[PDB]
Design a protein around this ligand. Structure first.
Ligand SMILES: [Zn+2]
Ligand SMILES: [Zn+2]
Length: 293
């Protein structure tokens, strides 16, 4: 259902006020950004072009045209809901987005939850894995969904990065569709990760871990020293402090997998040489030895 939310372009002051009114009623708001491609293709996001929002208060994806509205008009109406710690702001890897909000818009969001960090926290608690996984892998592992990929032309342009890409006005439909996709996926993901008994990590602990990332990356200037040893992982000391010791396989003792994934466990089960069933040996097989039925 969330996957079918339509988008609405917010590029006037009137539309901005209506969107803010909707978002103020939410408990959670999924957030994302489209920025100008940079010729350097540097860590810091380029000029903010869109901010995207999808909340649990209304079936819609808001595409805020910051370029058109201007950051000053956008921030003035969005600042308080972004600073409102009672409204959860959901991100999938918030690091560069937070830095762009701080540097370009002058705002530090409060009440952030990073769902990519959430998935890694689970991988840490269960397997001592601190790797960050991409959106497609997380959607499949958590929700079972195969992510529809963005328009390949939009993706090619961004990978080339020899032009801004997102400066074009009006935006073509497949650019707007591309821009709306991830915040749908983020709100959908929060349904599986937040308020779920079967998730082996407290949401509050991932809120505290995420807050370390917001504090590190919202400092009003470009971040030089990264929080993580490589871009594709989560600081191990932060995981130990907020999530706890890393886990491992209860069956063989190794880190990196769980007992449900353990090859030694499955391969070590008795397998009947006579009928092939797992769980009993041929000596105990009723089919081979009817004198046992
Ligand atoms: Zn094992
Ligand atoms: Zn048998």
């Amino acid at each position: 259902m969330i996957l079918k939310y339509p988008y609405r372009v917010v590029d006037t002051h009137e539309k901005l006020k209506e969107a803010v009114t909707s978002l103020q009623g939410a408990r959670s708001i999924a957030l994302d950004i489209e920025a100008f491609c940079t010729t350097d293709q540097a860590k810091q996001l380029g000029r903010i072009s869109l901010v995207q929002a999808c909340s649990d208060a209304k079936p819609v994806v808001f595409l805020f045209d910051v370029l058109t509205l201007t950051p000053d008009v956008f921030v003035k109406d969005m600042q308080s809901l972004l600073s409102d710690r009672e409204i959860r702001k959901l991100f999938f890897d918030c690091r560069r987005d937070v830095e762009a909000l701080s540097c370009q818009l002058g705002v530090k969001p409060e009440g952030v939850l990073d769902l990519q960090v959430f998935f890694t926290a689970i991988q840490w608690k269960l397997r001592s894995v601190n790797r960050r996984s991409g959106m497609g892998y997380v959607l499949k592992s958590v929700a079972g969904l195969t992510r529809q990929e963005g328009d390949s032309a939009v993706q090619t342009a961004m990978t080339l990065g020899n032009r801004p890409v997102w400066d074009i006005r009006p935006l073509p439909d497949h650019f707007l569709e591309y821009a709306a996709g991830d915040v749908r996926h983020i709100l959908l993901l929060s349904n599986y990760l937040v308020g779920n008994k079967d998730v082996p990590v407290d949401v509050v602990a991932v809120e505290r871990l995420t807050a370390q990332y917001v504090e590190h990356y919202a400092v009003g200037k470009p971040v030089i020293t990264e929080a993580d040893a490589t871009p594709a992982e989560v600081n191990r000391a932060w995981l130990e402090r907020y999530i706890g010791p890393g886990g491992g396989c209860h069956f063989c003792g190794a880190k990196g997998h769980t007992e449900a994934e353990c090859f030694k466990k499955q391969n070590g089960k008795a397998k009947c040489s006579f009928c092939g069933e797992v769980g009993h040996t041929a000596r105990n097989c009723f089919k081979k030895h009817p004198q046992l039925l």
